Ligand binder design. Sequence first.
Ligand SMILES: Nc1ncnc2c1ncn2[C@@H]1O[C@H](COP(=O)(O)OP(=O)(O)OP(=O)(O)O)[C@@H](O)[C@H]1O
Ligand SMILES: Nc1ncnc2c1ncn2[C@@H]1O[C@H](COP(=O)(O)OP(=O)(O)O)[C@@H](O)[C@H]1O
Ligand SMILES: [Co+2]
Ligand SMILES: [Co+2]
Ligand SMILES: [Co+2]
Ligand SMILES: [Co+2]
Lengths: 599, 587
Amino acid sequence: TLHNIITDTENVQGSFSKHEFQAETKKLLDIVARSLYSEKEVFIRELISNGSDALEKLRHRMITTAPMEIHLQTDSVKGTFTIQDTGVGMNKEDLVSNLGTIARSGSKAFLDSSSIIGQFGVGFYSAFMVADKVEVYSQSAEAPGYKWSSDGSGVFEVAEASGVRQGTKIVLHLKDDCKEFSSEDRVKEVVTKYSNFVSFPIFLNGRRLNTLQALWMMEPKDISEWQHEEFYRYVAQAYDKPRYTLHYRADAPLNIRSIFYVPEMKPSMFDVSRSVALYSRKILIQDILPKWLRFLRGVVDSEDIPLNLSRELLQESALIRKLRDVLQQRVIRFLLDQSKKDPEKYARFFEDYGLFMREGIVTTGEQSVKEDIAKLLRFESSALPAGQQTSLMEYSSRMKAGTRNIYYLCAPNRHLAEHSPYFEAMKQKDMEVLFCFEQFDELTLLHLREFDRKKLISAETDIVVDHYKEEKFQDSKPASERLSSEQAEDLLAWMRNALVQRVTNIKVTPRLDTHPAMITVLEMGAARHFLRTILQPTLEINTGHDLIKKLHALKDSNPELAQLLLEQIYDNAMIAAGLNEDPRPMISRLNQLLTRALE
Amino acid sequence: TLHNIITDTENVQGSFSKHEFQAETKKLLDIVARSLYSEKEVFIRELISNGSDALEKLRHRMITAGGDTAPMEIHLQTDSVKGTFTIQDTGVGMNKEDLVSNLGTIARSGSKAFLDALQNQAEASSSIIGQFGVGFYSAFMVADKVEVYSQSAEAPGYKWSSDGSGVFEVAEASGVRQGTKIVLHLKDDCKEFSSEDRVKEVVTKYSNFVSFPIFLNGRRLNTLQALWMMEPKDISEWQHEEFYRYVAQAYDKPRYTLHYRADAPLNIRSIFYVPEMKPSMFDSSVALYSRKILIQTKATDILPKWLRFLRGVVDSEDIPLNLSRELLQESALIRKLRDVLQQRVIRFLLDQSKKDPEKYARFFEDYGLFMREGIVTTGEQSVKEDIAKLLRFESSALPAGQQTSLMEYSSRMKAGTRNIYYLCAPNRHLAEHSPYFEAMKQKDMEVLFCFEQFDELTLLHLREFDRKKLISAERLSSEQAEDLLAWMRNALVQRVTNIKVTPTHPAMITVLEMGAARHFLRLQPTLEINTGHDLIKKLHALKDSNPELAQLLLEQIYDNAMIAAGLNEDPRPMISRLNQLLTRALE
Ligand SMILES: Nc1ncnc2c1ncn2[C@@H]1O[C@H](COP(=O)(O)OP(=O)(O)OP(=O)(O)O)[C@@H](O)[C@H]1O
Ligand SMILES: Nc1ncnc2c1ncn2[C@@H]1O[C@H](COP(=O)(O)OP(=O)(O)O)[C@@H](O)[C@H]1O
Ligand SMILES: [Co+2]
Ligand SMILES: [Co+2]
Ligand SMILES: [Co+2]
Ligand SMILES: [Co+2]
């Protein structure tokens, strides 16, 4: 039933010849020039890094004055890119060894700090992506200037040159394909993109470039609020200022140097339907954050993320997942700390960004992550004054020992919640009820399902499950102000005839006071969400209510007006339940009822 | 104020000394083994691709040599006790010379030299995957020891073995089957590749559409056919639906299918799907392949951003690949492909609106936000008007629910008409009663009614379409009303500031500026009263007789008009008060 050809049948015969790996050098040069880097512009990043390393070496040799800088020159008339650094330079041996040998890195044998970028020994050859001819003038410290020249076809020549300034100058005779790198504006774009945090001054055609400090690598105390505003505007390409700043450093289990910002501007709803930069040794390298935290701006840097040869890919997908989980938990802890510090400011944050907390809860499969994010949610309570926000953890700490459920109610505003027909039935019990006003709060709590091993249950659902338990409820009005059992059952029989296929059951409830009726569905939250795109509703009436009392008299007094009224009582309860369809078609019927009621 | 040190001051003194470029082979071996890819699991994709190429070379030789139609298979075996991963193909194999040359030399590609000598039309020219010469070394990322047994089809078997540290060994071996067998002794941290389920995940991810059958521990894996390589007619509708669910990881059906084949600027065999299900807040896309091997599960450079709602596959045998085989090189051919594909999809969707306008109306309802996003995002005015051909709006000349396009409108204009006008309103009731729509109606003419979100932002960025700019268009006696008017103006001073009289519904709400209406749905309405309605003449009578009932009645007339104007879709705040009004009315 299985088809396998792999069997241990091979046996070594005689001696073995030992060999050594070889390399096709000319083929390797073509690979680096045509297939290594996915974008041609990164040759500027490679040459600047080499200039930075050469300067870092000279700075190290200054322990035993001279200017230490990088100069870029573009000539559109001759189509040349030129970079010159004032670093250690290279002698006759170093030019042949370092530049002539692929994968040979002098920056490897130099050790023996953490300010060197090169390690692979191939980055220099990126110049042959954009240039047909490359000239290198190098003058070593102490040390006879030499000129290195090649075309990238597998051969180079070296001759002694005079008048070579200390350091190294490299001239790229650009191909006709890549004349854009003889443009000053284009070259300045690439420098700002990849090399904006170099530790040495960079000059472009005589003008000094506005390099920045890598704030994420600095001590948080040495960073002012003004410095964070400037950095936020650069990394987020924004014009405002951050309302929250998280500067997170860690060394275990992973190296982390990061800064996250929350914009003071509210998120654009156009951009929400359609964020953080990753760096290494202060060079841009472009997953890191969960989807629901995409509203964060800033920078993440981790020495534990290996880069591929082209310096544009991350190699440890298991570490990125682990990094993302660490960052996620650190942001949750930070946001909770903002709630306790300034709850008024956090109330505006949750109002502008709370939608991301709800998305994260709905789209996550891990229950512990759902509950971690749910700690950020804020609601009102029936046990607290109006306007005072609370949380699920604060609700849990008020629960008695004998309770195992968290009750909530979803209504547009505080007044509708306090005077809801579903909260009137809950007042007969002595449980606290969360008041949730946001449009997607019910969907969120439905996906959350439980918090701290306590089941979430809506007021509407609990009212229906009480029907299948004990009738432990008393009417808010004495029996003298309600219909008798003969009168109520006579009314219920008429209602079932006038509302055949519209309702499943009609019953009298002793749990209402101000409202004449209500609609109950066991899975009310799921019905309200499905309506965002004829079910089996139950109509529960208040026989103590004057409007219901008048309905019983109208079915014999004015039978046609009584049916018109019954339809409006049903519609009012459907609207109040959040289960109404289009409210426009009922306005025509309601105006007809108002004229007839007013004689 | 300038400071430049770059000056032409160098002059060569002496003679040149010529040298050839070198390679530090031991360091380079390490670079190509672990520094090329983003995932170490890639060694499985590389070794299966190499075995496919060996099988392809064997199939090509048999066109002339005429073998016997050997099995031609790829077999994988895992051993979780010894920690080994084994792959064997029944392909063309390698003698001792080819083992030392191909395996021992970095960037040496025998498949590349095979491709160069083939006739450019031969079948094997478009299906051989190798070219770089480094893919095999990815095994040393996951293995401390690599052994290769190979038997060529000529005349002796050989064993090639190495640890990946500069040297390798070659010896004669007996019992070596025709083809190549590679045994990887997995490192401790890469033991997962000795697990059957893990190997099956990698094969499915990258090599699911390899031509030749693939066996794992005696069980077949690649059962799916590359549908994009077939003739569009020879593909039935049920095959597209089943292939769509696989490529899109979906569970519905495609509402639109575009099977696109072309040869310029690149060879392209592609299949695009539009899902039948709407996008949701809780949330793959078009994958890129090359010679049946996955390059990117989410292609980035081939389609514009606004077409990210499309699902499916694009395969190109000659697109310039990055060394990592998970990226594309920067190429003018790839930039032209994106423009060709953009025009192709636009044309396809335009043909669907002619083929089935009702079905296209449902499509534009679900995915119109991507058309609108495309017009705002792109910078070329020519592609703005191309995407604008897909836009649909309502009109004042057509009844409600009927749609028209910008081209399906520039025709019905008058002869001397260089302008076209639109009105972005929440709904039709507000648009038909907009004071600016009356002005655009007195001078004949017709206004587009735009109700969708960002419809205003779309037409503003559109500026001009079809060489024509888009310019926004922005019984009760004789005088018993003022006694009711001034009473109505006073009872709701905080809601409206203008209450008029206009000759079913007792009253209606109108809004002056439409920009203020959408701000309210996230203003100053004009309550227009009719003197002839019963509730209005009843409100005038109850005004002084029953003041409590008159206040509840006025509030209900106001709220009912707000509902009829679409400015109140959740009438929950009124239910309790309406119940009090009904009770006091039926005394
Ligand atoms: N501007 C320079 N001045 C002095 N020495 C240099 C300069 N550029 C390169 N070198 C030397 O030549 C060597 C060639 O480096 P190459 O750019 O090929 O790779 P790398 O920078 O060592 O490593 P990577 O490939 O990771 O960038 C370097 O190790 C360095 O020692
Ligand atoms: N069965 C086989 N498995 C792997 N390589 C083989 C096989 N038969 C022949 N070869 C040769 O080994 C060479 C090494 O290829 P590799 O280093 O992976 O780079 P590429 O695949 O791009 O040529 C191939 O070009 C191919 O000619
Ligand atoms: Co054995
Ligand atoms: Co307690
Ligand atoms: Co000169
Ligand atoms: Co040819």
